[PDB]
């Protein structure tokens, strides 16, 4: 199975999903000089009030916090999206160490972690009709930086314990992830792809400029999870990032001046 170990990680991926070498891959370094503020921008709109959130999950190569996607609740439209996209889960990735773990660096510079909110284009039903189509997907993606506490984070660290190894999950109703933005909603966007396996070339990125602040005690639980079942040898659920990719034949816009 694919992984992010020296004989699983992203440099054999390609054998078994040869999209790995295509054409709009994801990550990629964010060139702040060369990326373009794009007028034909509309205001971008995250509008999370009625979310619903109803599971935690340790999948084997990160946890992801589920919604109802049911219908329109947590949703994301405007700046580079035609339409609406519905919130499906989030999940973060991080380093073994403060100075990598994101998947987009800014200018070469990696940060602790990051989180993508993921969304599908309510045009194709579902999500998995909307990954077999070039708009099918905009993730919103959000760095980590280690310093001051998250307090939006906090309900999300304290329940890790409970989904320490790969297959199990928790119950996870009632979180707001309104608590995980920072002020600014400035952003660059691309078009790219999943950054994990099957690496479907689906998404529109949308990224953050502005930073989250969360503590080095909150982090570090992070890092106490495993990639591993119960019973299993324990191998610590760290580096579970894609590096950057190349941009290939693809611009960077920003949204603001
Ligand atoms: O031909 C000029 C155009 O080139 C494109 O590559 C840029 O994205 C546009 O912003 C610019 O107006
Ligand atoms: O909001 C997410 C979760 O936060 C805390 O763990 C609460 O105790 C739990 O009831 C809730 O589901
Ligand atoms: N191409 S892959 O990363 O999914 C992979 C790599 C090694 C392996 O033994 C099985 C799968
Ligand atoms: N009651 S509370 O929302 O302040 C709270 C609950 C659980 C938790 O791990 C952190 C904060
Ligand atoms: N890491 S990612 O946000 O690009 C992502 C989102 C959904 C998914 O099924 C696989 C990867
Ligand atoms: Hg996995
Ligand atoms: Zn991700």
Avoid at 88 to 99: K, M, R
Avoid at 195 to 210: D, G, R
Avoid at 237 to 249: C, F, G, I, S, T
């Amino acid at each position: 199975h694919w992984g992010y170990g020296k004989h699983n990680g992203p440099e054999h991926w390609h054998k078994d999903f040869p999209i790995a070498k295509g054409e709009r891959q994801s990550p990629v370094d964010i060139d702040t000089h060369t990326a373009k503020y794009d007028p034909s921008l509309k205001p971008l709109s995250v509008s999370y009030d009625q979310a619903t959130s109803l599971r935690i999950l340790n999948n084997g190569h990160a946890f992801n916090v589920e919604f109802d996607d049911s219908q329109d609740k947590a949703v994301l439209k405007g700046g580079p999206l035609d339409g609406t996209y519905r919130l499906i889960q989030f999940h973060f990735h991080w380093g073994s160490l403060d100075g990598q773990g994101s998947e987009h660096t800014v200018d070469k510079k990696k940060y602790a972690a990051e989180l993508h909110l993921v969304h599908w284009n309510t045009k194709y039903g579902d999500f998995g009709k909307a990954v077999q189509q070039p708009d099918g997907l905009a993730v919103l993606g959000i760095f980590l930086k280690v310093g001051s506490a998250k307090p939006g984070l906090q309900k999300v660290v304290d329940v890790l314990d409970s989904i320490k190894t790969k297959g199990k999950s928790a119950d996870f109703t009632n979180f707001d992830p309104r608590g995980l933005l920072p002020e600014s909603l400035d952003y660059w966007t691309y078009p790219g792809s999943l950054t994990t396996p099957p690496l479907l070339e689906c998404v529109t990125w949308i990224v953050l400029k502005e930073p989250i602040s969360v503590s080095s005690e909150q982090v570090l639980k992070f890092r106490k999870l495993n990639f591993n079942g119960e019973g299993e040898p324990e191998e610590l659920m760290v580096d579970n990032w894609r590096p950057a990719q190349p941009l290939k034949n693809r611009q960077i816009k920003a949204s603001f001046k």
